[PDB]
Amino acid sequence: TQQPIVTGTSVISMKYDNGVIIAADNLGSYGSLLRFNGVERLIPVGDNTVVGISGDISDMQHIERLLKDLVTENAYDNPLADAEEALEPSYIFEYLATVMYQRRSKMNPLWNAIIVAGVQSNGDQFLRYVNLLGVTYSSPTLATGFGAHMANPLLRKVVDRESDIPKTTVQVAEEAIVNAMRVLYYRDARSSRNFSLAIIDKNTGLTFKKNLQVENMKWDFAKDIKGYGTQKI
Amino acid sequence: GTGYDLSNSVFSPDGRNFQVEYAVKAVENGTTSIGIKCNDGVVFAVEKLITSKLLVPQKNVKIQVVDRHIGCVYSGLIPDGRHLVNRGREEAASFKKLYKTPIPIPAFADRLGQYVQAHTLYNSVRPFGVSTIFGGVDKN
C-alpha cells in the first residue's frame, strides 16, 4: 500500500481510419502545487507503439525503465529484432497488464493509469487501457482520470462505434484531440497549457510532436461577469 | 604422487591448475574467432563450419550482443559461451539499474573476469571451455 506524490493528469487517445492518436500534458503536480513543467508522459517503444502514463511519476519512471529493458532484452539473440520479431503494441500492453495485476495482487500497486496506443504488424490499430487494479478494456476512444469524464464525450461524437473508424481522417481525429486538450485546460485544475501529441499511422509511421500549446481560447466573455448574483458593477 | 588434474580447484606441485589448462584444449579444438580495435570502435568476426548443405545459411548466429553497445564472440564449447553471455547480460542490467549509465567496457570485462575466475575456486564446478573476445564503445 502507498499514496501517489508527484502526479500526471489525463492521457487522451482515439483510433482513426489508418492509425491511433494519443496526447498528454507536460505537468508533474505535487498535490495542488504545479511543481514540474518539463515532464514527458508519452513513452515511445520502437516505431509502432506509444505508452501514455498518468498517476505517480516515480512509478511512471519505473515503468519507463521496464520498457527500455523490454527493447534491450528483445534484441538479445534476435536477428529479426527490427523486422518480424520486433515488439508489438499487444506484446508491450500484455506485459504491463501482467505487471499491474501482480502488483495489485501483492497489495503494492504501481499508482498509474496507462494507455498503450500503436499499430500492429498487420496494420490493425491497437488501443487498450490498464490501471493500478490491473483492470483492462479497449474502446474506439480511451482517456484516464479527468479525460474519461470530459475528453471521451467529445471524442465519441467523432467515433461513437467501430463502423465510424474507417470514416475518420487524421485531420478530423487530431483536431478533436487538440480541442479536448483545451477543454481539459479550462476545467482540470491539475492540467497544463503545454502538451505532447503522438500519431502512429500504418503509412506515415510514428510522428511525435513536442512543445504544443493550447491556442484559440475564449476568455473575452469574462469582462461581462460581475458579483455572484445581485452586484451590477 | 599424481591425480592433481582430477579435481578443479587443486594446485599441482608447480603451482598450476590442470583442469583450467584442459579447458584451454577444448577452446583450441574450437572454431577461430577474432576482434579488431579500429580508431573509433571494434569489429568482431568468426568462422562458421558448414557441416552439411542442410544447415540453413545465415541462421545459426554465434556473435551475441550484451546490452546494446557490447559485442561478444567465443571459441570452444558454444553452450559454455552462451552461459557466460547470459551472466554478462544479467551483470550489465544490474549495473545500468543502479548507476543509470550503460556499463563501461573495462567494468563489464572485470564482471565476466570475476565470474570465470570463480569457476576455478571450487571442485564442485567445471572451468569455462571458451575463450571470449568482446568489447564496444563507452564514455572514453
UniProtKB/Swiss-Prot annotation, chain A:
Entry's localization field: Cytoplasm; Nucleus
Q: Name one Pfam family in it.
A: Proteasome
Gene Ontology annotations of biological process type: proteasomal ubiquitin-independent protein catabolic process; proteasome assembly; proteasome-mediated ubiquitin-dependent protein catabolic process
Listed A to Z, the keywords are:
Cytoplasm, Nucleus, Proteasome
Q: Which GO terms describe its cellular component?
A: cytosol; nucleus; proteasome complex; proteasome core complex, beta-subunit complex; proteasome storage granule
Gene3D superfamilies from the UniProt entry: Glutamine Phosphoribosylpyrophosphate, subunit 1, domain 1 (3.60.20.10)
**What's the chief localization of this chain?**
cytoplasm
Q: Which domain of life is it from?
A: Eukaryota
Which protein family is it in?
Belongs to the peptidase T1B family.
Q: How does it assemble?
A: The 26S proteasome consists of a 20S proteasome core and two 19S regulatory subunits. The 20S proteasome core is composed of 28 subunits that are arranged in four stacked rings, resulting in a barrel-shaped structure. The two end rings are each formed by seven alpha subunits, and the two central rings are each formed by seven beta subunits. The catalytic chamber with the active sites is on the inside of the barrel. Interacts with CIC1.
Chain's role: Non-catalytic component of the proteasome which degrades poly-ubiquitinated proteins in the cytoplasm and in the nucleus. It is essential for the regulated turnover of proteins and for the removal of misfolded proteins. The proteasome is a multicatalytic proteinase complex that is characterized by its ability to cleave peptides with Arg, Phe, Tyr, Leu, and Glu adjacent to the leaving group at neutral or slightly basic pH. It has an ATP-dependent proteolytic activity. PRE3 and PRE4 are necessary for the peptidyl-glutamyl-peptide-hydrolyzing activity.
Q: Any other noteworthy remark? A: Present with 16900 molecules/cell in log phase SD medium.
This chain belongs to the protein called: Proteasome subunit beta type-7
Organism classification, top ranks?
Answer: Eukaryota, Fungi, Dikarya, Ascomycota, Saccharomycotina
Curated annotation (Swiss-Prot), chain B:
Q: Where in the cell is it found?
A: Cytoplasm; Nucleus
Report what the Swiss-Prot or TrEMBL entry states about this protein's PTMs. The alpha and beta forms are probably products of the same gene with different post-translational modifications.
The function of this protein is:
The proteasome degrades poly-ubiquitinated proteins in the cytoplasm and in the nucleus. It is essential for the regulated turnover of proteins and for the removal of misfolded proteins. The proteasome is a multicatalytic proteinase complex that is characterized by its ability to cleave peptides with Arg, Phe, Tyr, Leu, and Glu adjacent to the leaving group at neutral or slightly basic pH. It has an ATP-dependent proteolytic activity.
How is the quaternary structure described? The 26S proteasome consists of a 20S proteasome core and two 19S regulatory subunits. The 20S proteasome core is composed of 28 subunits that are arranged in four stacked rings, resulting in a barrel-shaped structure. The two end rings are each formed by seven alpha subunits, and the two central rings are each formed by seven beta subunits. The catalytic chamber with the active sites is on the inside of the barrel.
Q: What else is known?
A: Present with 12000 molecules/cell in log phase SD medium.
Please state which protein family the record places this protein in: Belongs to the peptidase T1A family.
Protein name in the entry = Probable proteasome subunit alpha type-7
Q: What is the lineage of its organism?
A: Eukaryota, Fungi, Dikarya, Ascomycota, Saccharomycotina
